[PDB]
Write a structure and sequence with these properties.
Layout (H helix, E strand, L loop, with lengths): L31 E2 L8 E2 L25 E2 L3 E2 L19
Antiparallel strand pairs: 1-2, 3-4
Protein name: Pollen allergen Phl p 2
GO cellular component, one term: extracellular region
Organism: Phleum pratense (Common timothy)
Length: 94
């Protein structure tokens, strides 16, 4: 029963996209973030220390897509995770 959920952490400011991917249970290994037409899946960047952030380059910022790699060894793609006008302080995912 795959039911994960992220959380746009405060890490987001200018062009940062932080997420508090954590639903208790499994473990944290690595995370991969997408966009729409950037350049295929792009492994996140553990720069926040507690969460995963992403530096956007394009002027447009629509929905995102994730597919962590839990230490346990279980991946899964996620579409329509974050909305259009996301608000840092909520959850957006399947």
């Amino acid at each position: 029963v795959p039911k994960v959920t992220f959380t746009v952490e405060k890490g987001s400011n200018e062009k940062h996209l932080a997420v508090l991917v954590k639903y208790e249970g499994d473990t944290m290994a690595e995370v991969e973030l997408r966009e729409h037409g950037s350049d295929e899946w792009v492994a996140m960047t553990k720069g926040e220390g507690g969460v995963w952030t992403f530096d956007s380059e394009e002027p447009l910022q629509g929905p995102f897509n994730f597919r962590f790699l839990t230490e346990k060894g279980m991946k899964n793609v996620f579409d329509d995770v974050v909305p259009e006008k996301y608000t840092i302080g909520a959850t957006y995912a399947p």
